[model samples]
Target: PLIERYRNLLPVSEKTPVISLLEGSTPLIPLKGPEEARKKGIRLYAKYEGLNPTGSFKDRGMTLAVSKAVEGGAQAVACASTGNTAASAAAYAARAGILAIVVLPAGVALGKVAQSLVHGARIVQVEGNFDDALRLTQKLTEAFPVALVNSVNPHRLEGQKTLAFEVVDELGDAPHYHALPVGNAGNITAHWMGYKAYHALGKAKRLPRMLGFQAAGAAPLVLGRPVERPETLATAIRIGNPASWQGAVRAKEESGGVIEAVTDEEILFAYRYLAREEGIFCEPASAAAMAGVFKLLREGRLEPESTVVLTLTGHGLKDPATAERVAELPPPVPARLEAVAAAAGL
Candidate 1:
């Protein structure tokens, strides 16, 4: 019944027995040492959103956003995304028989751009940055028949909330603490709403405090002011003006949690750690949460025994260029079949 309810949250209401959307049921991977995390003084685990169909957690939101738009008689949808959102919206909108128009920065990685195009979206390479792309799209929506599907839209947040439900369901209770990286900060706001909804409906025994992390170079929330110019290697979270900025502040205040920024060095370290130790490949935004969690744990801000869940927002593939340097390829060999087999130890 719960799984059905969760599925119903998607846009289509088809009653097919095998109505597959290629979404949901992503892994909740426990760190190698749940026991050692307790005994060694820091409890840490990952909700691996990298497993989503579009290789990023945004598929959850896109499933709801595009489905709802289609049902509401929308002909097309538009979004200004850094990368993951574009790929997700493009794929889901294609499934719903609705056109998706995605706008991105001009100089974005070619791989990410190609992924959206592969999903059959109309790609618009805006000559400006993400904020500029967003502003342009906002203006375009007024002149066109397309609906904007960014975090600025309410429905996207509705879909993101389901992630909160899945987490609480897997844990059998709300965690003592929750953490995620903040780009436009919509994820934090969505999770806070879901936690409250669960507690109000008696689904959760209690609500966890929300801990939001941002790229150190883009720490607008922590700075309590917009960054004049935010720069970070974590491209997904390089937003200077978050659409859900005020909502994120409310989530932090109401949940009794703090919003902080982790440096690029810290994020890269966490990224490598999750990959090298846990076999979980994630984008830098995903690693930002782990870096923040580790920092809190090491500094004694997070209790040694507290149950903590950190959200890994996107797959390493979403930003393949960033991960290419981390991949350890075998030494070059002859182009023979045997060479390939021997190199791979097959």
Candidate 2:
């Protein structure tokens, strides 16, 4: 498992040559709200991953993967991503002095594309959807010298497990339950590895149940089948077949959790609640976890006071269009100082 590799490799800063690894230590935010507590009546925490260097949880994976790739003599790296991973890989590759090539679906959000381009990745837009783009990326990985930076890469999972490490560190034990939205399912699998490793090594006393939610339209894991065609408004999770589907299933089974799907409307509602209520502006995928949290609460399947940790996988800025669609933000600042003062009600 990648967790074993991480235990062997990245826990210490002395071994890694890359300075901007940003590998460990994302915050556990205690979300205090009447709305969040009414269902589970539990104290809730959200892993504040949007605050990472590349503004997404993917920064953890890219940092370590790029370091190892460069150390192994790779001159370039590539991946197929909806947005966050590409943006993160591009920025981190720039730091490591390697070329980053990102293949994205044609119809992805303009904001995501802009983030990748501005960060200096050579962006290639594939003709079909995410599945097509991913297939092409796999072929490219075989044909080119460029290292694939997807979660399919072992090192990527090693880096992602550190999130679980940080969570345990913050909580001083495993939470009663952990929940997150699954795209490629690699992240959930990574957390499972981290928790198991910590417990095995006597670092943690407990293991939390794993709860995974996927967009209703794109939930191959929930369906127990592959989605040959998938679509979702939560664009980041619009995957037809997750790369680590089996691993996700194993994680849920071992962690005493379930994998489910959340509707787009539910995701939207949670997305808004996070922004308007909890002061956490997150992408719909992040909101998807909040939606799952509420569902478990409503069904009375989960305790009100369980130590619930939901992962906000990416920054809201990575998908600015979603922020605009959900939040109804005002237009850009006016040029004149008087206009700015008037707009701000000064």
Candidate 3:
């Protein structure tokens, strides 16, 4: 478990019982990049955080957040999320024999809801957007006995920082750039915190420049203002006002990182490219980072021999709706081998 492995590094005492589902330690899978990157020796890897328990990187934080919630004698933990965090918090809360209450916006995917339902989370779906749901959750936690376990909670970011440690630990040094999608922007902030901590402690030689991408339709960081009605096919990152807005800005400004916007078209292209060509079935939100890298690499912004890491944040299964939109099943054919071969063009 990550808690056991990084016990000394984490903010925990012996009393904070380990409420884990063996989350973290996700693989850093090497990617066979496009010719633009391959010929230049620009090695790329996908920090496949989708492999974490509950099928998203949010588990890293949920494990710690729920443990601390339990330790603090909270009977129930609450959160507001677009999707992944809700599932993670619910699962970890269940594991610790505590109540998990989630307030979600109207547009969350059914696949993500399925996990929360199976975990017996008390889910309240507001008829509003993610921002409204978050506001209500914040107030609910304040007015009730439930503890807030969202990324705004410091423990969530602390646990998420372990992702950077894993990347540096695996590579023996920080990559040239760390790319990921920004919704609430906590992941990017926590990633920078990890690299900064490791570099100061001599555990890493340097820090990677953070490359945060957002759906062009929902890119407050890139637009320099809050989007009142953020829209995107990638619902997980459809947050207009990020909670960790300051931390995200600090990460970008301090680390010399770039926060850019990728159109839904670009995100879909990257989504298909990763699934069809690269054998990585990540969610649409994760592909925003892939698209971001494509833009930077094509403009010759990256060095030829530098290493780049993209965080594929969630599994494609998280959003079955996007899968149907991205690709449809082929028309039925005869069950005979002759028909199959004709359809296969083999």
Candidate 4:
């Protein structure tokens, strides 16, 4: 549906099947300002992407990648993912009537692994980090007949670029700023590409400053080098070296934006803040954008009435273990209506 909606902007052919899970057109929800935002003079909105079929933004790109794979006559499609990407690739591959193989680092989020398994994808657990899994996937695809559907594939970025188009279309213009978590960095690059293309075509008069954040534990862009052993509670963005590193840098520089790192503590705090204050539950990595906005607000970088859009990339349910680890469980009481009412503070 998304591709058809913007087929002239996308790379598609008559031969390409319109395989879709109706993945795009996610909501642009206005965030309920908490005390901090109110005091800081910031107007915030969240692009809720978790509503996609696979529960993450990866669905946007996977649709195009798998279609291209089918068009190219590939019997199988493969990729390396921390969780979201694998689930998306597997689901899209299934839709395209081809075999799917996912290479993942051991001990990934159970929900991600479960999604791939339920989609009938062959899973391979590597002994190392995400980069290692990617390396192996590249080698396997090179040696076999499988199509690589990772972000490194140009078609994936082309499809993902449509998100920016949707944002401008929904808002009637670009916001003052756009923020998102950067893992492999392809998303930021793709968004920048979309914004520039729209502006050039007179669809949008201006572009928003891109603000990309990475987890402090695995922030190669902030560090300006690759991390040997990237570690973070947000497994979705636990990438050491991004394949789109140069493209990300170019996007930031061209857009006069910045890329910073958000610590795990700040990420978790933003995670809870969104859920409790705005009734928006998003994954840990998705909160990195919120954390960055808070940091900018504290530094007085944002002005009054500045419209900001934060992209919540995945659903909180994708990583239930993290929520369970931090949540306070209530103790069971005797089965009585009075007790239940009292416990609920009614």
Candidate 5:
């Protein structure tokens, strides 16, 4: 359980019953990078967060948030999300025997919406994007008794910070760089806070440069402004205004990090590359980290002999439509040995 594992670090007491879905301890798998990177002695790793119960990294924070909600005597938890956060909150709330209310943007991936529905969340589909939905959720929480379960919640960050602790603990120290996709921007901020906290406690020897990437069309941080009409095929990262915008900026500046944007084409390319080459299947938004790294390598900005970790935030199955759009399946063949053998090139 995540809470028991990091109890001293979190805002929990012995009396507080832990609510978890065994959400933490995701694998940190080493990746084989491009020839240039290998020649230059650059090592790449992927933090596979998609293996969580809800098929996304959001489960980490949701466990803590829901626990706190129960502790606070709340009957219901609420959030505004594109997809992952809603599913996570709903699942945790179900386990805790509390109601989960999710305000979502219309036309989100069916896979994500289905998670919320299956988990018995009360879903409200707004006719706007994620930012708009968040605004509404904030207002609802303010006027209602439902606890907010979004990353904007303080304790949610506390839980998410554990990701950094796991990374450093596994590697025995911080890597040269840490990269991840930025949407609502909370994860990047939480990661930086975690790294700094571990170093302060002497748990880690050094800090890593944080690299945050956003979809090019929804890159408010890179543009230094809020995008009113953000657009991207990577729906997980299509937020125009990030809730933790200041924290994200501070994390970048203080860590000597960089935040940039990658186009949908680059994101999809990296998405396919990971599945085909590394046998790691993750969502398109999760590929923004690799896309940014590849861009840096091509531009000669990333140094050689350095170690980098990329956080793949969500599972590929979370948005099957994107995969279907990118790669079409062949027509079904007859159930004959010769037909299957010919298709398999046997």
Candidate 6:
């Protein structure tokens, strides 16, 4: 269990039942940096969180949250989600022998919804966006017996900080820059907390610059205000108002970082690049992090010889629709070797 691996640094105590799916320990895969980056000696690494228990980074937090909920004698756990959180909460709740209640904004990806359904979560589809679902979930948890397991629940972020711990442990120090896509903005905040904690503990000699990228269409943080009707192909990050707004701001300000927006085109480009070139198939929002670093590389803004880490938060399978959008399958061909070879360009 990740909590067991980082127990001394985490908030868990003896009573915190380890309701784990053995989450964390995701790969820190090196990328073939772009010509510009390679020439400048700037290396790139991807912290691929897509390989987690439930196919997303949320499992890291959910394991601890659900365990803590069961410890509190809660019969159920609840969360409002765009997609990944719903699936993660449901999986964790299932593992801990409790009901999972999830409120989702309409138009989330099919695979995410399928996970929640297969996990037996009671799904509530809100007519509005993620903000409305979150608001309702908060109210429901306040009046009901279900324990809230969102990032706002505090334990979620506590569990999530372990990602940074793993990174430092792997590289033996924090990267010069840590880049990720921000939606509700909790992830960047948790990452900052972990880096700072490790730095204070003398495990890291340097703190990373938190480079948060948001889809331009639904970039509340980048816009410096709430986006009433957030729209983006990266459904995972289509939030109007973030629950961890202040935490995101603090991370940016304290770390000398920037929260910026990237176009869907750039996101798709990076998505295809990672898939075709880097052999990493990640979700569009996850690709946003790659897009961000690519943007920085093109702009020649990153420091020379620095290491940049990107958090690829979910697998490409989570959004099969987008995969079809950015890719193509070949037309039917004869099963004979010659025909197959022709199709394969052999």
The parts of candidate 5 lying over 4 Å away from their true place are: 104-112, 125-136, 330-346
Query: Which pairs clash in the backbone of model 1?
Result: none
Q: How does each model score on TM-score?
A: 0.87, 0.87, 0.94, 0.93, 0.93, 0.94
Total clashing pairs in model 1: 0
RMSD of each: 4.3, 4.7, 2.0, 2.2, 2.5, 2.1
- In candidate 6, stretches whose alpha carbon ends up further than 4 angstroms from where it belongs are 104-112, 125-133, 332-343
lDDT of each: 0.81, 0.82, 0.90, 0.88, 0.90, 0.90
Give the per-residue lDDT digits (tens) of candidate 4, residues 64-118: 8888888878889898764788789889888888899988787655665789778
Model 5: per-residue Cα lDDT at residue 83:
82
Please provide, for model 5 over 165-231, each residue's C-alpha lDDT reduced to its tens digit, 9 standing for 90 to 100.
9999898899999999999899999999899889889997888999999999999999999999999
Q: Provide the lowest-lDDT 10-residue window in model 6.
A: 104-113
Q: Supply candidate 1's per-residue lDDT for 171.
A: 87
Candidate 6, lDDT over the whole model: 0.90
Local error of candidate 4 at 54, Å? Answer: 0.4
Give the Å shift of residue 290 in candidate 1.
0.5
Clashing pairs in 4: none
The candidates, ranked best first by TM-score, are 3, 6, 4, 5, 1, 2
- Output the better candidate (1/6) by lDDT: 6
- Which pairs of residues collide in candidate 3? none
| lDDT tens per residue, model 6, 1-346 | 9989988988778998889999999999999966778999999999999999888998988887888888888899988764788889888888988999988776555565788889898988889975699789889888887899886778889889899999999999999999999998989999999999999999989999999999999999998999998988998888789889999999999999999999999999999999988899999999999999989888888999999999999999889889888777879998899999998999
User: Higher-TM-score candidate among 4 and 6?
Assistant: 6
Collision count for each candidate, in order:
0, 3, 0, 0, 0, 0
Better of 1 and 5 by TM-score: 5
Give the higher-lDDT candidate: 1 or 4: 4
